[model samples]
Target: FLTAVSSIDTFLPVLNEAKLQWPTSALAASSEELLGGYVGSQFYLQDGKYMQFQIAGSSNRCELRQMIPDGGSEIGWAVDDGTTHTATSSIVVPEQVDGVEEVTIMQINSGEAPQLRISWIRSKSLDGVAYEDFIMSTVRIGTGDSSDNFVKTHLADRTAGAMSFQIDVKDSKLTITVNGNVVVGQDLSFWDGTDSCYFKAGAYNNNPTSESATARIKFAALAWVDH
Candidate 1:
């Protein structure tokens, strides 16, 4: 287990410049335009969550970063038993939302693909609570067709696992896998060269907390149709 953990930590190095600026523009023969997305600079204090992005106007991409001190709370990941942390960087996408025909997201590198889970908790009269499970949407991006093509699966209830999801560029198709299991496969061709991708934990809910979550999701690699 120690070795496995070390491998994941080493598989990708700190999401460096190489992963951040992979050659997507050159492949598509275009450039990305930063449509004014402010990635909050307070990275060390987000309490276990972080986000980042790149667009038209900045030397560095914007990112939101949070570190969970404890293992359990209202939000979590695949390795819930550890005093672990979550630090992620992504390109925010507010302008690209409307034209976003599809989105795919996956929890990468689970020892056994973790079941992407989300539930709502309703409280009453002060400290009471009620947790209701919803049909959580799994894929953050995918090919613009099948619903199940991006649905989350239960690899094993409590085993630590990781997965990856890729958006199918308009004219191109990329398949992402975790532990040799294909999790996402899709396509899109109309994406602007500058459009960015987005990801979030939990789901739209009446009750939100930072506890009992799933997967330490990371943006391993990203690619889209360039203008």
Candidate 2:
């Protein structure tokens, strides 16, 4: 049933557009070379399906991991059984990327947040949508110690190996699970049938105090299912 996997190119263009709005020190020449200027930050592409994102630096700059453009239309979610949508991925996240304090791995993005977002919050508040109300739901896995309007999950100190993360939404219920265990379950009754949402993956740094900060993550597989 998952025959039509959308091309990554559809999402790359959006990231490129966002790049133009970034600070000069964070300019990237290509999708795979994102954040190349930051010390120790790099992106690696293996085969055509597997990819890795590593970020390290002291700058407050952020980078976009990856996202499908107009994801709802790209995934045909508006027409599919909106009653149920599920997205999953397999990846490994270190406790900290080269000692970076915080990082984010996934987001259930909307127009307010845009799926491909990767950066730190400069202000106490977010633009467009309040940080909490930005997405139908959001899931972050790493060493961050705080929680906000979105869902948050922390990986154990010895948490190694490839872990699986899944976001399942049906009716107004949203469920997030990590490695077969439920991490967050919430009611998204306010997610009425108006806006389209999309999925995002990769590391988003929450703090970059160290000039040598780095966050490394590997995405081994991804899948989307509807019912």
Candidate 3:
């Protein structure tokens, strides 16, 4: 069994950046606004328990990035407990919010631009390159409108609270679920399985170019289990 420990060492630099210029202005920041190692306030976690936080932001793509200490290169595809395992989390959306049409709740990516994004977007750009990949959402899950490459799953209404997401990558496969229901399952052998890959959660604004919006969510629970 892997012991779960609380580490708060990596986010200092990112917090410093937030103080300088967090993306809250009417116009987009001229530079590529990205801060490393910040996940809001301090948090704690124990076995089988969830780490909860109130995440809220406007006109900004607020996210909690998973930091790999030895740098992302240290992470490679591996099977836990001699078999496929799962990583899951549940988020409670704010009862009332505005300017935000969709929330990019989660992502497992090559740690590069565009990355492998799984969220609510108008187009699915699954070009299968370093960063380009398909996008899916609650509305397109059951409808035939979504492409075959994307994970078409149902997300709770932005007005509706509590949405859960899960990702299980094993047996050369990738599967995603929403609130315990399977949404996208497919072969990910194409995933070079190399490059600095990691997981991130929180709200990334869908309409950054046109609209200004805010996203708030309470990350209620998260778990990583093997075997």
Candidate 4:
């Protein structure tokens, strides 16, 4: 829940290992593949399941607000709890990308203790009457305790309203900018440290009592982050 912010032109390369990926199920690709070939009447088909996707382009190259490691494999996804929740999903990304100048990955996590992240383009719309900035938000399902949200518990901690960092090649350091300064930093190489409490890497793990939770990322180009 702790928040941080950084504005550095020299973006550090995010360790590819940091951006974890899950295996794709037939359901994820099946929907698009099947729907694309369908020529008959358009039918409304919802998988009733959740999945995670990755973002590409420049958005990925920018620095992150902050990075919290749950020691190792601390961050996780969940889904389909038996309570008032159903399915869930989410998306996560790091500080660098290939061709694009910026990229935002969205995660849709569902189930108990649901976790999520949202990224987006900061520029307002350049054309059209429906002008507005572009952004991508990750959502999770099946979070427990309250039906409000899965990441609310910990996200509530990062309430400083600002997160920042700088990106580079070998290693990029990120800190939670509170009030307007980088107060907390993540030791990418180590898990336990003074800033450990700020991060609950295992904040959202496999919760059986909750609904099915899935993780995925969505890309957006004309959205902005709402303070």
Candidate 5:
């Protein structure tokens, strides 16, 4: 009989289109040479299946660690450039801890701020405990900052564990899904008509307190397709 394989334990190697961003200046300086996150580097340095990103925040710190387009030189595709683009990832965020009510994990970055943000928000559970709710928001024209951008759809009572997200931009329209659930589908005409963009995923921790907080996120099976 054939032995079982270790398929589930493997994740696709390094993010081919992005580079690392440290959470602190000190951390960034020491990691200058490894910014490219090439294969064979530390897991996080490679953005591989074994990768895990963590950011710590206190009164003087605000977590901003993430992955951006390597050099932000290319990798940008406009609506008509490919006609369609698809990106996917499987991620896990552990139980919420003290401090920082909001923890940003994924985003579609654009010049006008992030076009999309997927984050975990801590809330009081009906059982008298606390848990994180997974939610998505978009910043669009006309809405401004007068109100929050939440899409009003969410996965409730989710504090931790693995979840999958998919983003599709086809013919100037955007569609998003989570664990095979279609959570959002909308038009991208609201964009600057032809602005280039890219995907970013990591611990972009938010809010600060005296107690400090740490947001750790793990990634697996990341991929991008253009057609």
Candidate 6:
């Protein structure tokens, strides 16, 4: 026999940053730029689903950030609160993305300059054969001390599949881990006295959330076809 117990909810996804829908509705993007594409921000909030990114990033990178909070809505958390939190994920970067592209999987974004990043890179080819990849953790306040701001460690070759990733934040410091192994830690001593912070995860590359400039999808097909 079994008994019931208490439960708890940990996370939520609103805007990236919303609309007149539920917490997880994948409505067609209302932004003028994304005519036909849908934004998954609300959908992930209600579904708590793992996200996938297939946009291109090899030639350019102007990307951005992830973790939002509860009650506070889409606003970020502040390091001044002195609370401990961790952003964790099991991520995959396929060979199609890039052979040696440094794709950020997580970040410690804040008002601070040179935000901390934990990224992934692999040596796989477009063909079938490939070698293993690695996870790199880095943070630099300025050009002067960028050296001590970086480190990396091994990640098993999952053959373009998912592997564990994590970044723990406590007392305004960040510790990055790969597959439960320590990679690197960055202290927030360089931050201004009052800075807010948050965690973001994904390919962290130059991917558009809007419909492609070159293409758009057709929809509302109510007709049936004979096979």
lDDT for each residue of candidate 6 in 29-98, tens digit (9 for 90 to 100): 2212111224442222112333333223232221223323222233355544566666666655544332
Best by lDDT: 5
User: TM-score for each prediction?
Assistant: 0.26, 0.55, 0.53, 0.22, 0.70, 0.54
What's the candidate order when arranged by decreasing lDDT?
5, 2, 3, 6, 1, 4
Q: Per-residue lDDT for 206 in model 6?
A: 24
Q: For model 4, how does the per-residue alpha-carbon lDDT over 119-188 read when each residue is reduced to its tens digit?
A: 3332333223232223322233333455343221111111212232211111222223222333332222
| TM-score, model 3 to reference | 0.53
Candidate 5: pairs in clash: none
Query: Which has the higher TM-score value, candidate number 3 or candidate number 5?
Result: 5
lDDT of candidate 5 vs native? 0.54
- Residue pairs clashing in model 2 are 55-214, 56-213, 97-214
Off-target runs (Cα >4 Å) in candidate 3 are 1-59, 69-85, 112-116, 120-152, 155-159, 208-212, 224-227
RMSD of 6: 12.9
Q: Pick the candidate with the highest TM-score.
A: 5
> What RMSD does each model have against the real structure?
16.9, 10.4, 10.6, 18.0, 7.1, 12.9
- Name the runs in model 1 displaced over 4 angstroms: 1-14, 18-158, 161-170, 190-227
Per-residue lDDT over 77-195 for candidate 2, one digit per residue giving the tens place of the 0 to 100 score:
33123557676777655455344655555555554433222222322333343332111223432224465444422322224677777878676566777678775646554445525
Worst 10 residues of 2 by lDDT: 16-25
- Of candidate 1, the 10-residue stretch with the lowest lDDT total is 28-37
Candidate lDDT values, in order: 0.24, 0.46, 0.43, 0.22, 0.54, 0.41
Can you write out model 1's per-residue Cα lDDT over 1-227, one digit (the tens) per residue? Answer: 01111123321233221111211212210011111111222111122332323222211212211112122111222222222222222322122222222122222212222222221112112124322211122432333556443444322111122233332222223343333454442332222232222222211212113222111223333322112
Please give the RMSD of candidate 5 to the true structure: 7.1
Worst window of 10 by summed lDDT in candidate 4: 2-11
